[PDB]
Amino acid sequence: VMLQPYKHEPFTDFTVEANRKAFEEALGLVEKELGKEYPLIINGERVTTEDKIQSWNPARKDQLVGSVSKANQDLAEKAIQSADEAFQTWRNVNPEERANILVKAAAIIRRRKHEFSAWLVHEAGKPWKEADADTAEAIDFLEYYARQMIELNRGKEILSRPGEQNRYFYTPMGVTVTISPWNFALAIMVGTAVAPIVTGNTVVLKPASTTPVVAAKFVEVLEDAGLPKGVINYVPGSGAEVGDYLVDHPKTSLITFTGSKDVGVRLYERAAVVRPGQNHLKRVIVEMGGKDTVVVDRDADLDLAAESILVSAFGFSGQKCSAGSRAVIHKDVYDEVLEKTVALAKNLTVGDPTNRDNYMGPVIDEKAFEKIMSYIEIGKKEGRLMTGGEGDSSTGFFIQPTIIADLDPEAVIMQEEIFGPVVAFSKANDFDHALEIANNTEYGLTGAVITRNRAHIEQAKREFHVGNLYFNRNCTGAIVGYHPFGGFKMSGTDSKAGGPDYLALHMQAKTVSEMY
Amino acid sequence: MLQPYKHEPFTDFTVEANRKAFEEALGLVEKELGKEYPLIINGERVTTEDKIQSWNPARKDQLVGSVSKANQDLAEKAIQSADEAFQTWRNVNPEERANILVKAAAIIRRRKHEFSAWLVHEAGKPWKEADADTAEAIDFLEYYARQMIELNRGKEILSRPGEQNRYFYTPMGVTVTISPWNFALAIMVGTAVAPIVTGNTVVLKPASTTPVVAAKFVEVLEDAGLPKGVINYVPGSGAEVGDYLVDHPKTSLITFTGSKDVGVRLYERAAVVRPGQNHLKRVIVEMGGKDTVVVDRDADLDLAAESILVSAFGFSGQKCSAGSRAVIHKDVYDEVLEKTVALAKNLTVGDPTNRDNYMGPVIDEKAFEKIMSYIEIGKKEGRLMTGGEGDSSTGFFIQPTIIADLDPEAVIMQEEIFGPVVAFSKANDFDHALEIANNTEYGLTGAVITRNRAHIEQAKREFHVGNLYFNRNCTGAIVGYHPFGGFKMSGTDSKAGGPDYLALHMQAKTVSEMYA
Incomplete structure (x- = not known):
């Protein structure tokens, strides 16, 4: 009895x-x-x-x-x-x-x-x-x-x-x-x-x-x-x-x-x-909401970086307040993390979620469908489309996993909550700049840092101002x-x-x- | 350490x-x-x-x-x-x-x-x-x-x-x-x-x-x-x-x-x-608070007299915790009232640099004016027992004031006076005293004076104040x-x-x- x-x-x-x-x-x-x-x-x-x-x-x-x-x-x-x-x-x-x-x-x-x-x-x-x-x-x-x-x-x-x-x-x-x-x-x-x-x-x-x-x-x-x-x-x-x-x-x-x-x-x-x-x-x-960020350091496991971005951005098609809709990456490692993530993203399965082999399902309704697609149009102008960017609402509300690159940290898609399967990549000069970009939203919910540097982990614990901060994994899936x-x-x-x-x-x- | x-x-x-x-x-x-x-x-x-x-x-x-x-x-x-x-x-x-x-x-x-x-x-x-x-x-x-x-x-x-x-x-x-x-x-x-x-x-x-x-x-x-x-x-x-x-x-x-x-x-x-x-x-x-000292039929009435006095007149009632209402069992109302009146008449009022003065003045002309108005309302609401006199000539001095036989819904039983004023009200029984106790829009402090253990435990549950005291004053939290x-x-x-x-x-x- 206890x-x-x-x-x-x-x-x-x-x-x-x-x-x-x-x-x-x-x-x-x-x-x-x-x-x-x-x-x-x-x-x-x-x-x-x-x-x-x-x-x-x-x-x-x-x-x-x-x-x-x-x-x-x-x-x-x-x-x-x-x-x-x-x-x-x-x-x-x-x-x-x-x-x-x-x-x-x-x-x-x-x-x-x-x-x-x-x-x-x-x-x-x-x-x-x-x-x-x-x-x-x-x-x-x-x-x-x-x-x-x-x-x-x-x-x-x-x-x-x-x-x-x-x-x-x-x-x-x-x-x-x-x-x-x-x-x-x-x-x-x-x-x-x-x-x-x-x-x-x-x-x-x-x-x-x-x-x-x-x-x-x-x-x-x-x-x-x-x-x-x-x-x-x-x-x-x-x-x-x-x-x-x-x-x-x-x-x-x-x-x-x-x-x-x-x-x-x-x-x-x-x-x-x-x-x-x-x-x-x-x-x-x-x-x-959140406008959450995965920051990737120059010493990161780059495969883990790409995997953590993928899951954070595209889990439940980005319809999470915790979603890593932003990927801010150290300059020495940006092109390579971006290519590893694109390579994972275009093999992700999108369809009817009653089917087990579909990783992503549809977005919630037509209102959300149209809002996400309108943000993608804005994004395509503000940045470099890498994969996705297509939607088809004829059967269900299906949007492809979308990666847009080279965004300016002030861009609309770097600032506004989209609540769809879209991640925006952004280049950082060094680690200090990466947290500066990370903190530059009006939100503070979740974030992740991928790094093998303890001093950088301790620095982000102090300086990365989100309620839930994660190291070397995705920024979603709180237990x-x-x-x-x-x-x-x-x-x-x-x-x-x-x-x-x-x-x-x-x-x-x-x-x-x-x-x- | x-x-x-x-x-x-x-x-x-x-x-x-x-x-x-x-x-x-x-x-x-x-x-x-x-x-x-x-x-x-x-x-x-x-x-x-x-x-x-x-x-x-x-x-x-x-x-x-x-x-x-x-x-x-x-x-x-x-x-x-x-x-x-x-x-x-x-x-x-x-x-x-x-x-x-x-x-x-x-x-x-x-x-x-x-x-x-x-x-x-x-x-x-x-x-x-x-x-x-x-x-x-x-x-x-x-x-x-x-x-x-x-x-x-x-x-x-x-x-x-x-x-x-x-x-x-x-x-x-x-x-x-x-x-x-x-x-x-x-x-x-x-x-x-x-x-x-x-x-x-x-x-x-x-x-x-x-x-x-x-x-x-x-x-x-x-x-x-x-x-x-x-x-x-x-x-x-x-x-x-x-x-x-x-x-x-x-x-x-x-x-x-x-x-x-x-x-x-x-x-x-x-x-x-x-x-x-x-x-x-x-x-x-x-x-603020409209605080109440409840006195049961079972009470040490000397203690009840003292507790009301201190709650009411401590710092000339200029306290959010001040016992400005005294709600007494019918069986003991006259006796507690006369005992409290006999203590209030002995309270020395004057310049607080003088140690022999238990009470000092109220804070300014505005506070003085507001309390005296409340005293004037109070006189038309019930029975003036002692005090009710104010002197503005050298400082803002108000006498320790007792008004009795109040309607539980009266102005001086509902509105915060922040002054050396107590309203007395007669309760039919303990259950009715808690009803009168809980009848303001405030919920700060109260006290229950009683020798009944069951009435104490019932008060812990049904006397809805943040600070609840038994067999003592309702002021002076530590x-x-x-x-x-x-x-x-x-x-x-x-x-x-x-x-x-x-x-x-x-x-x-x-x-x-x-x-x-």
Whole structure:
């Protein structure tokens, strides 16, 4: 009766015969379930609207993954009120029991692992590897934060002088509004919903409208793991009607957001306003974009350099806030790293991600497709096209892995988040110049340095100003409890998810002192 | 290496040698009155023609000091000075940053009674309050130095075979410290050196009613060995300087202590991303409290009488933690009321240089005018028991004032007076007393006086304040023993003098080296 130590959920080895077979079976399972209708969930009740959000396969744009009900202001209000009501009892449920519900939820997802992955394959267009990694990460968030809450329930040791007893401990806050992204349709949605839940807060969840079906699947799991009614509420909808209304509500205590900079800034600015009837300042956790950089030193393993750039730039087709969309390389080694990377990139497979042999799938929708292609046109003018630069939206939203070279560090494609499979190469005079270019964005989320020089490693630890800094590997693929994730500048509030400080952001410290 | 933290002992003024030492310090400070005090920008002394004059609140025509006044240009110069200082201060060994705090603590400890005497003249503090303020400044320096040494170890996170992951803290940037007049030494010191020891640099705008003791503390930091520009002393008006400091695109962190109306506007303005601003501004706010001492049927009513008196009238109620409401069980309301009235009539009011005066004046004409208006409202809301008289002729003296039989929703039971005023209200039972206790828009401190163990544990859960006390006064928190901060409109619950405090001034960084 103690939980066994946290460790990360292993990735599935699809070279084992039985793992592929099992994954293909789960893909068949989901395919037959495609096209289903999903209600809103408010206070445990299923609420269907006739106005709907259609969710489409990005690899097959006329394949309906599902249609979910669409909330409006009035249902957002009911969702808030349900959350507030449930909080009156939820804040007093023993932290051990709250954690147990997360542990039971993890075991349901673990048992149904490939099914959750195949949902991501279909709805988010994730390749096998990325889908598995995502599902593993959601499992981790559950197991990690369950353990963290039990640790935090112990409180913190403070001093008491003779004749008094002083105690410091953490208390639940209230209604949390969780606004989740599509690119980690399961993992981040799970983390940013359960961190508030396990800390005794209640949640109103607005998933991304491009991926709401997997979120409905997850709320079903929460119910099956024994979560009381109204503790989570499932309300997809428009930003103008539901998004803005949830953030502005006087009963919203906490907001947790993951998405783009432009939506984030506006959310952060609106949340700070003390509205009528609002008796508190709202706590805001924002995780916005990155314009991340892989820097390669003159002593680097050049093959490793090219491999780390490739994976950082083209994993999930660059649709990650952590993506190495910039490659800044030492002058003595730039032409050669650039040729090694081009050589890897043009043999990468792009297609339907239900097919295992496809390394990259499509981008999320037509809006993103067009945005990425428009950046590529800008890029082609600003730099030297090396490979890719083509798109075809006729079946799915497919863009080739794209490398553009010789960019000026001030270029549009060196500065702006593209969220597509594009990396821009940039020449650096020496190591000092390389970090100068690396730091020259308005963001500070992830970065990598490839070097065999210890002094250069120590220098970048001080000088490379990103929240997640990696040496001799890719700058993507943070693991819960191993690489706590969040960053600086226009990347957000540096709320290190999957780290030891994360739960306490969701709670209020309390000091009690009895004088004898 | 450093000996474990304990609080600086308070001075025993019943020992004649202590009185003698304190009276000599008052003589020393009296000789130094009416001096001129420049702004300190990047180590340079800047005199302006515009002057802020600091007057003794007990003798209103006495010039304690005249300080220079910043304008926008000088505010701009100070942010730039702090920004350039940050470029190297961010990289000073945490141990050395901590050691400067220790040396500063030693300077104040050696000149303890001198600093207390500065408080007596400038803020009107009685000997006990001035001494406790000075000891708390010493405590902040000692405690935060040690907290930084510990924080510099980082926190343990997991590494899978073949990698090494680390989680540690980094300095943020320029900090705007806006400090209160009521702990013109202690809180000004805490919220200046917490950013400093964490590697940030500070633009300090002290309260314009108490800028002289802040000028004195800046000199201490210089003498202890602080590099130029790490602190900048820049008093001024809220309009020319205060808003400009907050809104500056280079300002990274804002620490505020003060009133609700000012703290709320600052919070909302800080959240907007201004032109050329590359980050979201972190804000720590501690705002007021409408605090309540709850007296149970079971209580030691002598203790209950004393606790209410001290909570209410300590520093003439000029405290965010002040027990300005007394909520008493019906069965004991008359008896506690008459006992408290009998203690209040014995309280000596006058010039705080005189040891025999337990209470001094309020801070200025504005504060005097506001409290008297609140007294006039109070007389029409309930039953005036004692005091209610004010005298402006030589200083700003208000009598210790008790008003009884209040409606729980009355103006003087809801709005912060910041004066020597207590409202008394009768509660039907313990459950009703918690209802009245929790009925303000504030959440800072409270106390429960009771001999019922069950009612104590019920209070730990249902009395929603950040600082909760049993069988004593609700004032006088001690650094490292009673971490200080609260809920609702009391602010962000950033627990000053507590284990979580320094990490709020830093951004966490994850660093990961892959080996094979």
